[PDB]
Design a protein around this ligand. Structure first.
Ligand code: SF4
Ligand code: SF4
Ligand code: SF4
Ligand code: SF4
Ligand code: SF4
Ligand code: SF4
Ligand code: SF4
Lengths: 759, 167, 759, 167
């Protein structure tokens, strides 16, 4: 077919596009240190942008650190994909047609990057070999004296991001086409998520991690022996989504449950509910064994990436391991045999449920009396709290009797146990907060729609006109982790506000879990208040982190199916199209992990801006555009190659917001795109203006830079905005016919083709 | 207001100089083109009162970072909204017109900011720019030119009262 | 053939060995920092071995940092190997048989790890795919909250080390079998190494980096156009070794020269000698363009890993690039086309030699007048000096007139330019030192024997009996970088001392360059004072860093050829044999790079202890054995699996020495092995005792723990040591026949087989 | 001897307490099982003189790390050779009999050590062990319990003379 300039791209093939992006969106480096602790020549003081012993300056070191984070995230996703694909090929078979629904392009990222069009599962192995080889080449650059410019480190970070998206696509395709995941179903079943959805009177298996291959055998054993009714299995992190989507092509509600995000791991463990804990990989707290030994909770590892120092009993019989765990000889085991693990974990749950009875780390009513009337509010825990909660004030107010302060703190706390280790009184503050919010914990329930996987091309063809023309106000992609600044309600509030205005909201990862945990006055979550299709005012859950590739997939399929441009090895042109026409913005409010950084960078390279939380300023790189330099905002009209001016939107590719209201205003503004129809620009300007006036109290000061015609003004406020333009900015307005005759810097073009590439 | 300069994690070996109230007042009244950078934490009834008075004292223009603009709507101050991460990026460019169009600002006064946010934003200003930073918040900001020490809410309010008394 | 338990091993297959090793050699973690800045949950204070927000403690963080360094080094070596092998296959062909001399095991590391026996250049591609896939799996573990135990991070570091010794083997095999490198020649030509070996009256091309594929085209152009006589080409770092080994199967001396190690890069650039600088891939200072612009020195990059931000003009014609560089339009370029680069660099050297005339950054006298008599010895540079030289004192003494202090400091300085940025007077101290030692620079000449590659099986079969029995006192492998504490003479002194005692000294990397730069009273270097075969009292140079795999290959071939044990996928047994019988110790006096850490760890996993410089304590891990715990020193006799006691040797697997005399004593002691012949042990004890008495003034206090018989004692001092044993330790001695009858803890066994594996 | 505590690169927030001469003498004379850890830098004839006198004062056993044993051969002191990394590893094991066989040492006195070496060796002692460290060297050792400030050679010699005068 018609190929492209950059198939199987490397750091040198994508350099032109990366530098074109960085020319408008300058990188901003916020170093976390003024020292480089890398080789034995150092550490070198780089404060004041000085140079180390190798000559690297502060910007180079910050860029290297961010690039290392990006490649670490890409390596996580690629290793997950490789292991999952190998297991699927070994069990199911290599020659299995790929089944992702009724799509003309099952792999919109694989085709865009590697130029290939996979048909079976054996055609995903060369792609994974390309993502591992290039990952090795990129990790070779973190060495001392192996590069020196920050700009090329940024280019390699962009390449790592796109490779991460390719790896996520590979993993999601492999698991969806095999494990019977929903195939683009817009009405996937609603499932119950929450700590209070687990019945403590039954054996409980808590599956923490990200890989679903290991736990499929556990569920097969449970179904084959008729144990689903007499046992409970609950997932944490994205493995919960993967288990929930398992075998759900029949749309029947599942029996496995979702317990929460990473912030709930320590709370779940300390509550004593789990009877067995099985860990898989990726986001897994590195202190589970220490707490489980105190609470008599066995821990089974099932991976080579995570083994926790536990004894390896893979070749041992199941019964001997059960006896060894029951007698307390060992605090856990590492079972890499999937059949043996699937047999062992449920039997271990049965044999350990009666042994541990009401065992919990929560003080009941008496130890807390001293634990609260022992502290003197010395302020060390607040200094050690990542969120800087007023823990001494809350405890002091609890001393008088009012315990609602810690009840409030429970939502604002992430369960990290950093307050209990700086105290000089040895107060388990987290358990105190847990009991102070025990009522909420018992009433912590919600509904989340199961991951739909990939968006079919029918909905994409129906919605591409609205997206490109601007009729639909845009696609807000709420992704990322659960390291929120002010609790898990900011994402819910943003999603509700942007669904009330007919945006297309697409969620994935822990953000979907946090969104589905809150209810309105009628007790209905957002997932039952709004549908799950790909159109205006519809929230659709795409799945786990490995399914964050599907959002960029829809972004590329808008240019492929609708615009008609070819996808094979055409990263630059498709990214330019997405950056110039498609209105899509990502939001990672609680991103902490390197995987989130890799996903955000890959979305940047594809032309999708992203707004992160205040905690994500520790990634040491943002991409921000100078809105006062008129020389940056010039594109080439593809019809004749002449210079065409564009509005300053998006004014960034990665930025961090302080509060969720500022995030709402940013998301509303940065969905505006060049080549916006009159109706589309009118809708987007209307929504941005109302959001800014509601959440900041003032009209945006840059609103007059986005008006190219009276038609572009909001219909309800056309007169007042016309008066504002007439008086404040001296624009000449033909008032007889409500016409704008002088003042706009860019005349409205009926059909223009703005692009950044001269070719 | 300098007794407690304790920290949990350090950015390096160069830190902020813990200043008294008189030193802060002298620096505020000594700057040529100052800028009052106020975060969302200023919307606390106890702090929004002082911030407005400090701004009214020397007619300092205000950058109301985040969702803190609502507290400066009806007041008699020159307040404008700007993203902190975009403000920090713009302060390192000498050829930036500014919030009005007269250039950059030689010093920035910080009030009511989250510690982990302002520290990371100032890591890009104290290193790649030549702008002085005066942190009048209750926390100890390490990546600032001059900062207040750790203070309680009552002590922070008293220090702000002393500062405005000297302006 | 007869396979082994662990072919294509992973983190779980090598776990048993790794844990067997760590049971005797406990890890010692020296955390370089009290914080972790990995995810946005942090930074987390881990002082006092506290736990972060994810539960990781200080030991876990230090282990993760060291493991990240190890995988970075492994990735560097593996990427070098993959790129070199791809280029060789593309140009020469996939069907070429591997030519590594007369060896029945051309790949002693590939066969040991992957179980494969390559016979063609196309049989090295699956191996490199295994090293990239496992590298991706290992880099996936650096993610936040992935692993949770320091011991498993150590196990993964050991796996990363071995997969490095595999990647280095692949790269060396690929380049040796193709580029006509010497094939195990014990009479490789002596080449001139030194800055003063370059004639400033001719055009000079300085090749910095590690990859030789790019510069082979430059040399082909120079030879084809008859330019070797009228031009000079000099290499820095290991690319110099690769060039001087190019086409040297004919033993004719080369025309390319060696300028020095990494410590000489800035000095060479500032001296103004280079006319064109071409940078390949590794160990390249990241400030070359900044100095070259001031000294009008063009810079050409030739890799994707290193681009320096320079314009990419790969598709442009050579003449246009030459004109653009000559006019000063650009300060360099990136040329990934090898033929065009090979044509451009010599022509650029010709056209730029007459333009730059005596341009240098070395003030002679009058400009140095103020430069020296402006400082007031404020002591900041000494605070910023990594070696903590008395720079203020040297400058003050230079003010009076005596300039010999800086002349001395020149050898003790590494050219890192960290003293010129903390100064508040703006003194180019490095240039001051350079001129103060200008006379030495003019007299900086030496001879180094070209890399011999792999050790042939004939010499190994001749020397294995002496090595295993102990007749040869041991193999000292002086490897590593040039970050020496007290100049480049420590390695020379150690090599001379250990060659005077008939050890087998094998050198590689920058250490060979530093050893060959010093001469005795007759003006003969060690390479002409001693032969280059594999036997007692012979220094042999193996080549570059990629040739460090051949030392471990020799250690494995001792067990393969001599002991007769099979090699295919038999890592554990061969490593146990090497640790228990073969006397070999590595020395990395100036290791700074992550590659050195990976090489040291891989040598640890193979059972080869290593002594590092004092600067290598910043690697955050050592492997040290408790010499007072008698329970650690027990092995199993392979005849009947009974417990057999062994002497506390080696007392470490990785340690750091303070001075070179302590290093000599450590190397002498830790060459002692279990199952040492009464002669082998007499020789080793004699040498260790003499070295300890010479360099520390005292008899070793542990010498009586290594005596098992009268003949184990040194022959010359048998009587006095017998008296010492009789009086001090109460041993009962039959003085009639100088016999031992009571006192030795371990009886001498005529034929014992000590091993650590019960199986 | 505490005026200059300047550092180039830090390890964290917890640093060493710059102690005076009298404090050092009191701590040396107050310890129960002390250990004099002397590096190769003690071979300077200005320092080997004092080190021997300090050892003779309170009969402190000496760990002559590195190639510093030759300076303690003929002297009337109890000196033994040990590797610094091995010594630091052994000091974190409470069951170590010691250089003589009577257990560990509660405090270690450091003299004549290279900064980058002793700092990294002490990073494994101040974190994983319960051993006090008194650094009487002319440099400022950050990873020590109590250390001297940055001093010149003459000032370091004078401080050592004062230390011996108070012992
Ligand atoms: S990599 Fe460069 S900046 Fe970092 S420690 Fe080494 S020499 Fe210093
Ligand atoms: S650290 Fe402990 S004593 Fe201090 S305020 Fe917090 S809970 Fe109270
Ligand atoms: S566990 Fe919660 S309250 Fe304690 S430090 Fe962590 S976030 Fe703060
Ligand atoms: S980058 Fe991390 S480990 Fe290195 S000095 Fe800074 S906080 Fe410490
Ligand atoms: S990885 Fe763990 S220790 Fe490191 S910053 Fe994140 S939470 Fe803290
Ligand atoms: S930093 Fe400069 S002024 Fe200070 S002692 Fe060194 S050379 Fe002299
Ligand atoms: S350039 Fe030499 S003298 Fe200057 S700081 Fe580096 S090592 Fe020390």
């Amino acid at each position: 077919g018609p190929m492209g300039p950059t198939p199987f791209p490397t750091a040198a093939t994508v350099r032109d596009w990366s530098f074109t992006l960085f020319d408008r969106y300058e990188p901003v480096y916020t170093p976390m240190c003024d020292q480089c602790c890398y080789c034995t020549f150092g550490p070198c003081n780089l404060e004041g942008n000085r140079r180390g012993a190798c000559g690297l300056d502060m910007k180079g070191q910050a860029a290297r650190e961010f690039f290392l984070r990006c490649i670490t995230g890409c390596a996580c996703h690629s290793a997950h994909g490789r292991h999952l694909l190998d297991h699927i090929i070994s069990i199911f078979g290599e020659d299995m047609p790929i089944n992702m629904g009724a799509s003309n392009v099952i792999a919109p990222n694989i085709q865009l990057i590697t130029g290939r069009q996979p048909k079976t599962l054996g055609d995903l192995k060369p792609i994974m070999e390309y993502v591992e080889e290039e990952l090795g080449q990129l990790l070779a650059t973190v060495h001392a004296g192996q590069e020196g410019a920050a700009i090329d480190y940024d280019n390699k970070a962009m390449l790592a991001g796109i490779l991460d998206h390719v790896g996520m696509e590979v993993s999601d395709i492999a698991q969806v086409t095999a494990l019977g995941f929903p195939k683009s179903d817009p009405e996937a079943p609603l499932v119950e998520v929450g700590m209070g959805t687990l019945d403590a009177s039954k054996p409980v298996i808590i599956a923490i991690g990200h890989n679903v291959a290991g736990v499929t055998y556990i569920m097969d054993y449970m179904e084959d022996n008729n144990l689903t009714d007499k046992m409970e299995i609950g997932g944490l992190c994205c493995t919960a989504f993967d288990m929930t989507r398992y075998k759900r092509e029949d749309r029947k509600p599942p029996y496995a449950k979702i317990v929460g995000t990473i912030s709930k791991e320590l709370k779940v463990v300390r509550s004593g509910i789990p009877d067995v804990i099985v860990i898989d990989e990726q986001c897994v707290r590195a202190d589970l064994v220490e707490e489980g030994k105190k609470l008599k909770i066995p821990v089974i590892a099932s991976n080579e990436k995570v083994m926790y120092g536990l004894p390896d009993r893979t070749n041992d019989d199941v019964d001997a391991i059960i006896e060894d765990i029951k007698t307390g000889k060992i605090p856990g085991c590492v079972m890499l045999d999937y059949e043996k693990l699937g047999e062992l974990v449920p039997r271990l749950a049965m044999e350990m449920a009666p042994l541990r009875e009401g065992i919990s780390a929560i003080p009941s009513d008496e130890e807390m009396a001293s634990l609260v009337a022992k502290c003197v509010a010395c302020g060390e825990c607040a200094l050690a709290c990542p969120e800087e909660l007023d823990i001494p004030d809350a405890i002091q107010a609890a001393k008088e009797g009012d315990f609602t302060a810690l009840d409030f703190l429970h939502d604002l706390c992430v369960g990290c146990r950093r307050c209990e280790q700086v105290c000089n009184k040895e107060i388990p503050i987290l358990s105190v907060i847990d009991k102070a919010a025990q009522k909420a914990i018992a009433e912590e329930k919600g509904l989340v729609r199961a991951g739909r996987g990939q968006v079919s091309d029918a909905e994409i063809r129906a919605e591409g006109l609205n997206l490109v023309m601007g009729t639909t106000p845009g696609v807000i992609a709420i992704i990322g982790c659960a390291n929120y600044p002010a609790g898990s309600k900011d994402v819910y509030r943003i999603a509700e506000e942007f669904l009330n205005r007919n945006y297309i909201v697409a969620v994935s990862g822990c953000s979907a879990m946090d969104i589905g945990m809150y209810k309105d006055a009628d007790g209905k979550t957002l997932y039952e208040r709004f549908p799950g299709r790909f159109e205006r005012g519809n929230i659709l859950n795409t799945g786990s982190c490995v399914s964050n590739s599907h959002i960029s997939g829809t972004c590329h399929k808008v240019a492929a199916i609708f615009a008609g441009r070819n996808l094979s090895g055409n990263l630059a042109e498709i990214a330019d199209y997405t950056l110039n026409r498609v209105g899509a913005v990502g939001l990672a409010w609680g991103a902490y992990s390197q995987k989130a950084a890799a996903i955000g960078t890959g979305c940047n390279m594809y032309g999708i801006p992203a707004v992160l939380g205040p905690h994500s300023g520790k990634y040491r790189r943002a991409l921000i555009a100078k809105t006062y330099d008129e020389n940056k905002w010039k594109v080439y009209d593809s019809r004749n190659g002449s210079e065409l001016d564009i509005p300053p939107s998006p004014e960034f590719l990665i930025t961090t917001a302080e509060t969720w209201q500022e995030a709402c205003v940013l998301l509303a503004k940065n969905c505006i795109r060049p080549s916006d129809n009159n109706m589309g620009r009118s809708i987007k300007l209307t929504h941005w203006i109302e959001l800014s006036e509601k959440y900041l109290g003032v009209l945006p000061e840059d609103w007059w830079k986005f008006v190219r015609h009276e038609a572009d003004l909001p219909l309800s406020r056309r007169e007042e905005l016309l008066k504002k333009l007439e008086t404040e900015h001296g624009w000449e307005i033909d008032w007889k016919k409500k016409k704008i005759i002088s003042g706009p810097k860019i005349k409205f073009d009926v059909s223009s083709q703005p692009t950044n590439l001269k070719r | 207001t300098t007794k407690n300069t304790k920290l949990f994690t350090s950015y390096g070996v160069k830190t902020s100089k813990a200043i008294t109230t008189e030193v802060a007042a002298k620096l505020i009244s000594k700057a040529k083109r100052p800028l009052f950078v106020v975060g969302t934490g200023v919307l606390d009834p106890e702090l929004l009162d002082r911030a407005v008075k400090i701004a009214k004292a020397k007619n300092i223009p205000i950058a109301a970072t985040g969702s803190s603009m609502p507290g400066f709507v009806d007041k008699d101050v020159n307040a404008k909204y700007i993203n902190l991460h975009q403000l920090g990026f713009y302060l390192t460019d000498p050829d930036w017109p500014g919030l009005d169009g007269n250039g950059n600002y030689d010093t920035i006064i910080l009030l009511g900011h989250k510690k982990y946010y302002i520290n990371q934003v100032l890591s890009a200003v104290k290193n790649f720019s030549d702008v002085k930073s005066i942190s009048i918040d209750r926390n100890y900001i390490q990546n600032a030119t001059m900062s207040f020490g750790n203070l309680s809410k009552a002590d922070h309010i008293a220090a702000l009262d002393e500062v405005i008394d000297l302006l």
